Structures are given as C-alpha cells and as structure tokens.
Design a binder for this molecule. Structure first.
Ligand SMILES: *[C@@H]1O[C@H](CO)[C@@H](O[C@@H]2O[C@H](CO)[C@@H](O[C@@H]3O[C@H](CO[C@H]4O[C@H](CO)[C@@H](O)[C@H](O)[C@@H]4O)[C@@H](O)[C@H](O[C@H]4O[C@H](CO)[C@@H](O)[C@H](O)[C@@H]4O)[C@@H]3O)[C@H](O)[C@H]2NC(C)=O)[C@H](O)[C@H]1NC(C)=O
Ligand SMILES: *[C@@H]1O[C@H](CO)[C@@H](O[C@@H]2O[C@H](CO)[C@@H](O[C@@H]3O[C@H](CO)[C@@H](O)[C@H](O)[C@@H]3O)[C@H](O)[C@H]2NC(C)=O)[C@H](O)[C@H]1NC(C)=O
Ligand SMILES: *[C@@H]1O[C@H](CO)[C@@H](O[C@@H]2O[C@H](CO)[C@@H](O[C@@H]3O[C@H](CO)[C@@H](O)[C@H](O)[C@@H]3O)[C@H](O)[C@H]2NC(C)=O)[C@H](O)[C@H]1NC(C)=O
Ligand SMILES: *[C@@H]1O[C@H](CO)[C@@H](O[C@@H]2O[C@H](CO)[C@@H](O[C@@H]3O[C@H](CO)[C@@H](O)[C@H](O)[C@@H]3O)[C@H](O)[C@H]2NC(C)=O)[C@H](O)[C@H]1NC(C)=O
Ligand SMILES: *[C@@H]1O[C@H](CO)[C@@H](O[C@@H]2O[C@H](CO)[C@@H](O[C@@H]3O[C@H](CO)[C@@H](O)[C@H](O)[C@@H]3O)[C@H](O)[C@H]2NC(C)=O)[C@H](O)[C@H]1NC(C)=O
Ligand SMILES: *[C@@H]1O[C@H](CO)[C@@H](O[C@@H]2O[C@H](CO)[C@@H](O[C@@H]3O[C@H](CO)[C@@H](O)[C@H](O)[C@@H]3O)[C@H](O)[C@H]2NC(C)=O)[C@H](O)[C@H]1NC(C)=O
Ligand SMILES: *[C@@H]1O[C@H](CO)[C@@H](O[C@@H]2O[C@H](CO)[C@@H](O[C@@H]3O[C@H](CO)[C@@H](O)[C@H](O)[C@@H]3O)[C@H](O)[C@H]2NC(C)=O)[C@H](O)[C@H]1NC(C)=O
Ligand SMILES: *[C@@H]1O[C@H](CO)[C@@H](O[C@@H]2O[C@H](CO)[C@@H](O[C@@H]3O[C@H](CO)[C@@H](O)[C@H](O)[C@@H]3O)[C@H](O)[C@H]2NC(C)=O)[C@H](O)[C@H]1NC(C)=O
Ligand SMILES: *[C@@H]1O[C@H](CO)[C@@H](O[C@@H]2O[C@H](CO)[C@@H](O[C@@H]3O[C@H](CO)[C@@H](O)[C@H](O)[C@@H]3O)[C@H](O)[C@H]2NC(C)=O)[C@H](O)[C@H]1NC(C)=O
Ligand SMILES: *[C@@H]1O[C@H](CO)[C@@H](O[C@@H]2O[C@H](CO)[C@@H](O)[C@H](O)[C@H]2NC(C)=O)[C@H](O)[C@H]1NC(C)=O
Ligand SMILES: *[C@@H]1O[C@H](CO)[C@@H](O[C@@H]2O[C@H](CO)[C@@H](O)[C@H](O)[C@H]2NC(C)=O)[C@H](O)[C@H]1NC(C)=O
Ligand SMILES: *[C@@H]1O[C@H](CO)[C@@H](O[C@@H]2O[C@H](CO)[C@@H](O)[C@H](O)[C@H]2NC(C)=O)[C@H](O)[C@H]1NC(C)=O
Ligand SMILES: *[C@@H]1O[C@H](CO)[C@@H](O[C@@H]2O[C@H](CO)[C@@H](O)[C@H](O)[C@H]2NC(C)=O)[C@H](O)[C@H]1NC(C)=O
Ligand SMILES: *[C@@H]1O[C@H](CO)[C@@H](O[C@@H]2O[C@H](CO)[C@@H](O)[C@H](O)[C@H]2NC(C)=O)[C@H](O)[C@H]1NC(C)=O
Ligand SMILES: *[C@@H]1O[C@H](CO)[C@@H](O[C@@H]2O[C@H](CO)[C@@H](O)[C@H](O)[C@H]2NC(C)=O)[C@H](O)[C@H]1NC(C)=O
Ligand SMILES: *[C@@H]1O[C@H](CO)[C@@H](O)[C@H](O)[C@H]1NC(C)=O
Ligand SMILES: *[C@@H]1O[C@H](CO)[C@@H](O)[C@H](O)[C@H]1NC(C)=O
Ligand SMILES: *[C@@H]1O[C@H](CO)[C@@H](O)[C@H](O)[C@H]1NC(C)=O
Lengths: 438, 132, 43
C-alpha cells in the first residue's frame, strides 16, 4: 500500500503577479538601481510547454506606472515656471522674404519679474505658435496656463532612453519563450527561462515604434482580436528601417535670470539654414517592408482582398502626428508621406515635414505640463523603425489601415510579450511505497 | 550532472527528484545586494516578500516532523480517492506539473493529516517510552 | 426678507482678486459667514 510522502523543491509554478524591480549597468532617471550581473544566465527547458498571454501580462502595467513615477520625481526638484503666465506682446518674424517658413515663431516681449522682486524687466523670447495662443502687436498666452502650471525640465537631466532589465524576487521565475512564432497567446513548444529580462529602452513614441527588438522569420502580426476593428494591430519588423531626422537651426539660449535665484532658459536667436525640420526615409526600403507587412495581412483576410493605407482620422495633434523625443526636443511629423498606399488583390527618399513644440503633455495626462528647454545648436539624429501601431478601419474586399497610439502601455507590451512571471511552489506531496519507523 | 535552475522541470517526477537542491538554493536565492525614489521601496517590498514566501511553507515542514527536507516519509496512508494510479503510471510517466494538475484538488485535505495525525501520535508515545 | 429674522449672518463681500492672468486683477464677490470674517480696525 502507498503512503503520503512529502517533497520539497518541486519544479512547479502558478501564474501570479508580484512586484518587479529593475537592473541596469552602473541621464534619464536611473541610478538608484541594482547593477546587472556580468553573466546573465538562462536555460532552455526541453519538454516544457505552456501558454502565454501578452494581453493580460501585468508586467506592462507596472512598467508603465513606474516610468510615470520616475518622470514626476525627476521634475519636482526642478524650477517651476509659474511666473511666466503673463500677457505676451508678439509680432511676426521676418524670415527670408517672401515666406516659406511661415514664421512659426513670434518675437514676443513682456514685463517680467526678476530676482529683484520689485522693479521688473522688459525681456523677449522666441516662441512657437504651437505653444502660444492669441488672447481675445497682439496679445498672446502660454497655452498651458488655462489648464495647469508648468515646470521647466532641468538643463542637466537628459531624456535618453536607457536599457532597463527587470528581475523577479526569489520564489518567482522569469519565463521566456524562444519560439519565433507567436500569435500573441497560446502554447509555446520551445520555452526557456532567464534570471532577468533583456535591456529594454523606455522609448516614448506614437504611431511608429523606435529602437525596439527585431522579429525572426516573417513580419509579425499581433492583435487582441483581428476581426474586431475596435482593437488595434501590432506589427513587428524583421529589418531595421532607418529614419534620419534633422533640425537645422544653430540657435542660442538667452537664459534670463527670472529668480530670485532660479534661472530660466529662454530662446535666444535663430540662425543658420532656416529650413523646416524634417525626416529622411529610404523610400524603396519602406515600400519593400510595407509589402512584407501586406503579405501577412493577406494571410488573415484572404487571397482576394484590397489593402489601402492612409493617415489618421485627425484631431488632437498628439495622436494625429508622429510624436517622439530626440535630444530633449519634441517632434511632431506628418506621416502622410509614409502611410499613403495601396495593394491590389493578389534615391529614392521621402521627406516628412515636422513641427517643434516646447509645451508637452505626457501619457495623455492632464493636470500638469512640462516645458522643454531649447537645446542649443543644430539637432540631428537617426534611429531604427522596428514596428507599427496600426488600426483597422461595404466590407467584402477593400480594407483601409491607419497609424494610431495614445496608450503607451502598447509600447511596453510590444516588447514584454516575450516574458511572463510565475510563482514557484516548492512544497508538494505524492504517493510512495514507504512506512516511516521510530 | 549539473543541469541548472529548473533544469529537470521537463522530466518525470522520479527523474526530477534527482536534482531538487539545484532548485532549492534559488527558492530564497539571497545576495541581490534623493530618498525613496522608484524602486526605493519596491526592492524593499519584493525582498521582504521573498523571505515571507519562503518561511511560510518552511514552517509547515518544521511542523511536519521532517526538517531534513526535500524528501521524507510519513505514517499517513494514501487514500485511493486521491487519483488512483499505479507507481509506473505516476512516477515513471508524469511530470510534477501534470501531477499538481490533478492532486491540487485535495491539497488542504491532505495537509490536514500531515499537519496532524503523526505529529500528534508519534509524541505522547515517546513520552511513554521514556517511562523507563 | 424684511424685516430681519435671519439676522443676515452673511455679507455680500467683494474684492480685487488676482486671477490666472497674474497682472490684471478682477473685482469679484462671494457670500461669507460672519463667523469666518472679522472687521479690520461698506466696511
Ligand atoms: C541616413 O543617415 C545615415 C547615417 O546615419 C546615412 O548613412 C550613409 O549611408 C550611405 C549608404 O549606406 C553610406 O555611403 C556609402 O559609404 C561608403 C563608405 O563611405 C566612407 O568611406 C569612404 C571610403 O570608403 C569615403 O570616401 C567616404 O567619405 C566615407 O568616409 C562609400 O564607399 C559608398 O560609396 C559608394 O556608393 C555611393 C552612393 O551611395 C557612390 O556615390 C560611390 O561612388 C560608391 O559607389 C557610400 O557613400 C554612408 O557612408 C553612410 N554614412 C555613415 C555615417 O555611415 C544615410 O545616407 C542617411 N540617409 C539619408 C537619406 O540621408
Ligand atoms: C510693461 O509693458 C507694458 C506694455 O506691454 C507697458 O504698458 C504701458 O503701461 C503704462 C502704464 O499703464 C501706459 O502708460 C499710460 O498710458 C496712457 C495712454 O497712453 C497715458 O495716458 C498715461 O499717461 C500713461 O503713459 C502705457 O500706455 C502702456 N503701454 C501700452 C502698450 O499699453 C509698461 O509700461 C511696461 N513696463 C515696463 C517697466 O516697461
Ligand atoms: C525681437 O524683439 C527684441 C526686443 O524684445 C528686439 O530687440 C532689439 O534687438 C536689436 C538687436 O539686438 C537691438 O538693436 C541694437 O541696439 C543697440 C542699442 O540700441 C544699437 O547700438 C544697435 O545699432 C542695434 O539697434 C535693440 O536695441 C533691441 N531692442 C531692445 C528693446 O533691446 C528685436 O529687434 C526683435 N526682433 C524683431 C524681428 O523685431
Ligand atoms: C472579436 O471582437 C468582435 C467585436 O469586438 C466580436 O464580434 C462580435 O461577434 C458577435 C458574433 O458574430 C456579434 O454578436 C451578434 O451580433 C448581432 C447584432 O448585434 C446579434 O443579433 C447577435 O445576437 C450577436 O450578439 C457581435 O455583434 C460582434 N461585434 C461587433 C463589434 O461586430 C467577436 O466576438 C470577438 N471575438 C472574440 C474571440 O471575443
Ligand atoms: C489625412 O489626409 C486626409 C486626405 O487624404 C485629410 O482629409 C481631410 O480631412 C478633413 C477632415 O475630415 C476635411 O476637412 C473638412 O472638409 C470640409 C470640406 O472641405 C470642410 O467643410 C470642413 O471644415 C473640413 O475642413 C478635408 O476636406 C479632408 N481632405 C480631403 C482631401 O478630403 C486629413 O486632413 C489628413 N490628416 C492629416 C493629419 O493631415
Ligand atoms: C500633411 O501633408 C499633406 C500633404 O502631404 C497635407 O495635405 C493637405 O491636406 C489638406 C486637407 O486634406 C488639403 O487642403 C484642402 O485642399 C482643397 C483643395 O486644395 C481645398 O479645397 C480645401 O479647402 C483644403 O485646403 C490640401 O490640399 C492637402 N495638400 C495636398 C498636397 O494634397 C496636410 O495638410 C498635411 N498636414 C500637416 C499637419 O501639415
Ligand atoms: C524530454 O522528453 C523526451 C521525450 O519526449 C525524453 O526522451 C527520453 O530521452 C532519453 C535520453 O535521450 C532516452 O533514454 C534513453 O533511452 C534508451 C532506450 O530506451 C536507453 O537505452 C538509454 O539508457 C536511455 O534511457 C529516452 O528513451 C527518451 N524517451 C523517448 C520517449 O524517446 C527526455 O527524457 C525528456 N527530458 C526530460 C528532462 O524529462
Ligand atoms: C480694487 O478695489 C478697490 C476698492 O476696494 C479700488 O480702490 C480704488 O483705488 C483707486 C486707486 O488707489 C482710488 O482712486 C483714487 O482715489 C482718489 C480719491 O478718490 C483720487 O484722488 C484719485 O484720482 C484716484 O481715483 C479709489 O478711490 C479707490 N476706491 C476706494 C473705494 O478707496 C480699486 O480701484 C480696485 N481695483 C480694480 C481693478 O477695480
Ligand atoms: C453682491 O455684490 C455683487 C457685486 O459684488 C452684486 O452684483 C450685481 O448683481 C446684479 C445681479 O446679478 C447685477 O445686476 C445685473 O446687471 C446687468 C448688467 O449691468 C443688468 O443687465 C441687470 O439688469 C442687473 O442689474 C450687477 O451688475 C452685479 N454687479 C456687478 C459688479 O457685477 C450684487 O448686487 C450684490 N448683492 C447685494 C445684496 O448687494
Ligand atoms: C503676420 O503675418 C501673417 C502672415 O504670415 C498675417 O496673417 C494674416 O492674418 C490675418 C489675421 O488672422 C488674416 O486676415 C490674413 O488672411 C492672414 N494672412 C495670411 C497669409 O494668412 C498677419 O497679418 C501678420 N501680422 C502683421 C502685424 O502684419
Ligand atoms: C483652455 O484653453 C484651450 C486652448 O488653449 C481651450 O481649447 C479650445 O477648446 C474648444 C473646446 O474644446 C475648442 O473649440 C478649441 O479649438 C480649443 N482650442 C484649441 C487651442 O485647441 C479651452 O476652451 C480653454 N478653457 C477655458 C475654460 O477657457
Ligand atoms: C538598427 O538595427 C540593426 C539591426 O538590424 C542594428 O545592426 C547592428 O549594427 C551594428 C553596426 O553595423 C553591428 O555592430 C551589429 O552587429 C548589427 N546587428 C545585427 C543584428 O546585425 C543597428 O545597431 C541598429 N541601429 C540602432 C540605432 O539601434
Ligand atoms: C493563398 O494562396 C497561396 C498560394 O497563392 C497559398 O499558399 C500556400 O500557403 C501555405 C502556407 O504558407 C503553404 O503550405 C503552401 O505550400 C502555399 N502554396 C504555395 C502555392 O506556395 C495559401 O494557402 C492561400 N490561402 C488561402 C486561404 O487559401
Ligand atoms: C498619396 O501618394 C500618391 C503617390 O503614391 C500621391 O500621388 C500624386 O497625386 C497627385 C494627384 O493625383 C498627382 O499630381 C501626382 O502625380 C501623384 N503622384 C504620383 C507618384 O503618381 C498623392 O499626392 C499622395 N497624397 C498625399 C496627401 O501626399
Ligand atoms: C478517502 O477520502 C474520501 C474523501 O476524499 C472518503 O470518502 C468517503 O467515503 C465514504 C465511502 O464511500 C462515504 O461514506 C463518504 O461520504 C465519502 N466522503 C465524501 C467527502 O465523499 C473516504 O472515507 C476516505 N478514506 C479514508 C480511509 O479515510
Ligand atoms: C512598391 O513596389 C511594388 C512592387 O514591389 C509596386 O507594386 C509599387 O508600385 C511600388 N511603390 C513604389 C512607390 O514604387
Ligand atoms: C495499475 O497498473 C496495472 C499494471 O501494472 C494495471 O493492470 C491496472 O490497470 C493499473 N491501474 C489502473 C487504474 O488501470
Ligand atoms: C478539481 O475539482 C474542481 C471542482 O472542485 C474541478 O473544477 C476540476 O476539474 C477538478 N480536477 C480534477 C482533476 O478532477
């Protein structure tokens, strides 16, 4: 007869959420974080299979709110720009006649309170017409002042995305499938496990995904519900698509001592190649990759349907255009130049017009706003487009797709789908032929 | 042969029992190594939860007179209603995950007798053997 | 309502208030209980 035998160290686990913590090397917000191991360990697990589900992966939720928390903490100790909310006296800026630049900035002046709380000083600064609005030269207002206060980001702190690793506490395991195929959820024939995750950069962007990871095999299409056009579609590329964006303005920073003590960085003068900031895209590369994407689409909609690509529905600029950070500066680009195509039934280069804003609102959050300091000198950078955030638009053939975003949990999820966290249960029992003596 | 953490997870329960310690070590792990700040109380909380997580079950093994754990026998007989399979149908043809899939239904029920029967009776008895 | 059973108890106070436009102020008003306010030194 068999008896109850007690076992400990049993290799079993249940899907469970706990509090994850970071790790990264030894700028943005990361210093108070445990350095990574010089030899991150892993182990493929043979005969071990189980389901993943990226759409209920609470790792995303934590990461999201943690990044937000970091953001706020990095701003509290910086200078508040409360006394900037004043009536502005502004005029057009006579760019090289006649007018290709459309101005876009105003030579605003105003009676400003200085360190000598008492006698004020008439000063001036160049502002983008996206930041200011006419009251009622003419009178203008900082747009934020009708919604909330605004804080100047410190000139020392940066916004450069840094690779972050996530680790689980003892008793919890980081599981990672290596299956090159994945529908977004279901069993994985090839499952491994790791100490911690790979370095993920906290890149904030809409519409287009930047500097992410690459997919293997073919282009990956992932969606909570492909047939439901109330949902959206994640597209992961196989090959990095280069994009090179430039701001050809060797401008200065006429910092103004609007104390007491604390200093404000206003916009000095704009000189150099007065052209609109824009992005350069390899056209043939875009066409080629887009085609590869359409192949996938064909595979989930039929071998006799029509695929069209267009821009967004419009509205809030933050959603309408492609937003991203380069070197502290915030760009808004008209991606109509990319998302304008079509496919049937079965250099060259592209220039994307961009705009610059200085007053921005993070993560759709209202109640506060952050002032970007102007960055001195010409700003230009390059990155890898590694995926798309697409939405699905008389429904028997032609379908139209367009870029979206808004919810930045989407961005984190586009990477964390490779991971899941489980809770180990060391204690188990089993029937064994054994009668225990004294 | 050293396999690695959970290296035997994809094997039969008999096979897996070979290397329970390789797992045991990292069940508590250890090491790890402007105030507050994000992570400031998260590494705190997590590292705490690890300790609790561990001891909560370790104490049960303390109560279930074994202590010298990973494996030990009892004087509680197995009730046939708790998944009636043969040893070769169990130990030589089933993983630990597959095992739990079934037996998990009677977890607290089995714990009842483990928490008690023997622990109660093994003692008293001894106290009586100490009479002389 | 005349004559006076309520004893007032509130005053129709007005004042030059600083607004969102730190600069040009706005004459506003509000009803306060005489338990909240006290005479300095209409009044
Ligand atoms: C997006 O931005 C990236 C940078 O971030 C730009 O990258 C350039 O891409 C091109 C194409 O891949 C590269 O051009 C090729 O470079 C080769 C080597 O250049 C260096 O070394 C040579 C000697 O070997 C020097 O003479 C030269 O000054 C460089 O220092 C050249 O061998 C190639 O020449 C051949 O192709 C060109 C046409 O492309 C022909 O004209 C030639 O006759 C010859 O056949 C070629 O120039 C370039 O080096 C990359 N730059 C860097 C920094 O890596 C992309 O250009 C950019 N896209 C947009 C639209 O601007
Ligand atoms: C801060 O800049 C504002 C303009 O943005 C200056 O406003 C000027 O303020 C004075 C005082 O209110 C006005 O002067 C008065 O004007 C009337 C009519 O012209 C005249 O009758 C009075 O004798 C007196 O001069 C002035 O008109 C007004 N300017 C405008 C454009 O409205 C203010 O002077 C600035 N402060 C600093 C310190 O320079
Ligand atoms: C933007 O508005 C500012 C004022 O807010 C204008 O500032 C003016 O800038 C010029 C160039 O720096 C200054 O002119 C120089 O002044 C000195 C002394 O008066 C003189 O020696 C030089 O020959 C020259 O004229 C001017 O004084 C300055 N004004 C003030 C109030 O400081 C600027 O012109 C505006 N830009 C636009 C396009 O209107
Ligand atoms: C993926 O999501 C889509 C939409 O979010 C789900 O589509 C829904 O599918 C059901 C079954 O075809 C539709 O229900 C039927 O609707 C008609 C009219 O309302 C009603 O007469 C029937 O009694 C029945 O409820 C439903 O309307 C349709 N929703 C929409 C937006 O078209 C689909 O079920 C989702 N798939 C997953 C696995 O959940
Ligand atoms: C994306 O590109 C499309 C064109 O491919 C742009 O379509 C434009 O959308 C707006 C909003 O639906 C239309 O404006 C409305 O037009 C009517 C009549 O002209 C007018 O009564 C309204 O006051 C309003 O302006 C506009 O006509 C339409 N253009 C065309 C060609 O149909 C859309 O604006 C683009 N989005 C981005 C962000 O640029
Ligand atoms: C994004 O860039 C596209 C061009 O690549 C811009 O397209 C322009 O969109 C507007 C709205 O659909 C078009 O305006 C409408 O045109 C008709 C005819 O000229 C006129 O009847 C309407 O009153 C209205 O102006 C405009 O023609 C179209 N441009 C071209 C080249 O097709 C769009 O404006 C850009 N968005 C950003 C934010 O700059
Ligand atoms: C992963 O699961 C596979 C089955 O899917 C297990 O395969 C077993 O692997 C061992 C080692 O290659 C084989 O054992 C050898 O078999 C020969 C003949 O029976 C015997 O001469 C050797 O002494 C040795 O036992 C075993 O037969 C093979 N099983 C089958 C079905 O082919 C593997 O054990 C699994 N790994 C885990 C960790 O459980
Ligand atoms: C805010 O409300 C106060 C009353 O609560 C207003 O006070 C008025 O302030 C002006 C400037 O100090 C006084 O005007 C001066 O009065 C003298 C004598 O009447 C006259 O000689 C001067 O030419 C000048 O008008 C005015 O008398 C004073 N009112 C009272 C009740 O003391 C002030 O105007 C208000 N501000 C706003 C923006 O309405
Ligand atoms: C309490 O004090 C406030 C001022 O702080 C007094 O406000 C006055 O309220 C009346 C009623 O809302 C307003 O009268 C109306 O004005 C319009 C335009 O002038 C006119 O079309 C109507 O026929 C009517 O008279 C009056 O303008 C407003 N005063 C101001 C400064 O806004 C209120 O009367 C005070 N209550 C007590 C009991 O005295
Ligand atoms: C500043 O220049 C702009 C053009 O760059 C002028 O814009 C005009 O503004 C008025 C008022 O909104 C409109 O009636 C005109 O149709 C606008 N013109 C165009 C080209 O859109 C504005 O008038 C200029 N200000 C100064 C003082 O001259
Ligand atoms: C706060 O100011 C903003 C502009 O800075 C106002 O926004 C306008 O809101 C109406 C209603 O949604 C739209 O018709 C306008 O197009 C918006 N303007 C812009 C710039 O988007 C808003 O009305 C202001 N609130 C207060 C109470 O005045
Ligand atoms: C763009 O992504 C590509 C991967 O497709 C990156 O390629 C690496 O490029 C460097 C420089 O040539 C090589 O050292 C690496 O070995 C390349 N990787 C592979 C996979 O071939 C490139 O680094 C990416 N750029 C950005 C800015 O991240
Ligand atoms: C669409 O038609 C293509 C052929 O034009 C079909 O392609 C097959 O796809 C499967 C999956 O990749 C392969 O197993 C076959 O070998 C492919 N056939 C050939 C000719 O390459 C695909 O099955 C079609 N889809 C529909 C729904 O019928
Ligand atoms: C959408 O892109 C197409 C090209 O893919 C653009 O097509 C141009 O359309 C106008 C109007 O019919 C013609 O004058 C051009 O010759 C067309 N170009 C070519 C390549 O055929 C169209 O302009 C684009 N729309 C947007 C808003 O940029
Ligand atoms: C084994 O445990 C089962 C319950 O898991 C016990 O089942 C009882 O069995 C008797 C006989 O069939 C019935 O009178 C009871 O009603 C059953 N209980 C329930 C919960 O269904 C069985 O008694 C146990 N055997 C041992 C030796 O204790
Ligand atoms: C993209 O290339 C495909 C063929 O691969 C072609 O059908 C389409 O016209 C191309 N687009 C561009 C802009 O040339
Ligand atoms: C127990 O295994 C024996 C063979 O060893 C078999 O005859 C019997 O069927 C098994 N038990 C079950 C419930 O079938
Ligand atoms: C365990 O019993 C629950 C109901 O109490 C049931 O949902 C599940 O299927 C059971 N498992 C076994 C192996 O029968």
């Amino acid at each position: 007869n068999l008896w109850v035998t007690v076992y400990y160290g049993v290799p079993v686990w249940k899907d469970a959420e706990t509090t994850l913590f970071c790790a990264s090397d030894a700028v943005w917000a990361t210093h108070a974080c445990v350095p990574t191991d010089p030899n991150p360990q892993e182990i493929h697990l043979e005969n071990v299979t189980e389901e993943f589900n990226m759409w209920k992966n609470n790792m995303v939720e934590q990461m999201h709110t943690d990044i937000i928390s970091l953001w706020d903490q990095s701003l509290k100790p910086c200078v508040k720009l409360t006394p900037l909310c004043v009536t502005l006296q502004c005029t057009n800026v006579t760019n090289n006649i006649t007018d290709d630049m459309r101005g876009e900035l105003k030579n605003c002046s105003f009676n400003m309170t200085t360190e000598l709380r008492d006698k004020k000083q008439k000063v001036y600064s160049l502002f983008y017409r996206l930041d200011v609005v006419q009251i009622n030269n003419k009178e203008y207002r900082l747009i934020n002042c009708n919604t909330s206060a605004i804080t100047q980001a410190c000139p020392k702190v940066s916004f450069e995305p840094i690779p972050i690793h996530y680790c689980a506490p003892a008793g919890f395991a980081i599981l990672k499938c290596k299956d090159k195929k994945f529908n977004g959820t279901g069993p994985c024939p090839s499952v491994s496990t790791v100490q911690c995750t790979h370095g993920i950069k906290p890149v904030v962007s809409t519409q287009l995904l930047l500097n992410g990871s690459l997919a293997e095999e073919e282009v990956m299409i992932r969606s909570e519900n492909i047939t439901n056009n109330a949902k959206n579609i994640l597209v992961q590329f196989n090959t990095p698509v280069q994009i090179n964006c430039t701001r050809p303005n060797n401008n200065t920073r006429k910092s103004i001592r609007i104390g007491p003590g604390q200093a404000f960085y206003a916009t000095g003068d704009i000189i150099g190649d007065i052209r609109q900031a824009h992005c350069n895209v390899s056209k043939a590369t875009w066409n080629e990759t887009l085609g590869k994407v359409v192949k996938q689409l064909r595979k989930h909609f039929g071998n006799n349907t029509i695929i069209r690509f267009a821009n967004s529905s419009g509205g809030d600029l933050e959603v309408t255009t492609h937003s991203f950070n380069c070197g502290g500066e915030f760009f808004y680009c008209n991606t109509s130049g990319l998302f304008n195509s079509t496919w049937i039934s079965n250099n060259d280069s592209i220039t994307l017009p961009c705009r610059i804003k200085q007053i921005i609102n993070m993560w759709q959050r209202i109640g506060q706003a952050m002032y970007a300091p102007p960055i001195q000198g010409v700003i230009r950078c390059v990155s890898n487009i590694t995926g798309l955030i697409l939405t699905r638009d008389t429904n028997s053939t032609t379908e139209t797709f367009r870029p979206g975003g808004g919810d930045m949990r989407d961005n984190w999820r586009s990477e964390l789908y490779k991971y899941k966290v489980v809770k180990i249960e060391p204690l188990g029992v089993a029937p064994t032929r054994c009668k225990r003596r004294v | 042969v050293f396999l690695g953490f959970l290296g035997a997870a994809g094997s039969t329960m008999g096979a897996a029992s070979m290397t329970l310690t390789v797992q045991a070590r990292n069940l508590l792990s250890g090491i790890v190594q402007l105030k507050l700040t994000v992570w400031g109380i998260k590494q705190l909380q997590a590292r705490v939860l690890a300790v609790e997580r561990y001891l909560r079950d370790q104490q049960l093994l303390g109560i279930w007179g074994c202590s010298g754990k990973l494996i030990c026998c009892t004087n509680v007989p197995w009730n046939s209603s708790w998944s009636n399979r043969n040893l070769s149908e169990i130990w030589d043809n089933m993983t630990w995950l597959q095992w739990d899939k079934e037996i998990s239904n009677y977890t607290q029920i089995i714990y009842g007798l483990l928490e008690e029967s023997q622990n109660q009776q093994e003692k008293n008895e001894q106290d009586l053997l100490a009479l002389d």
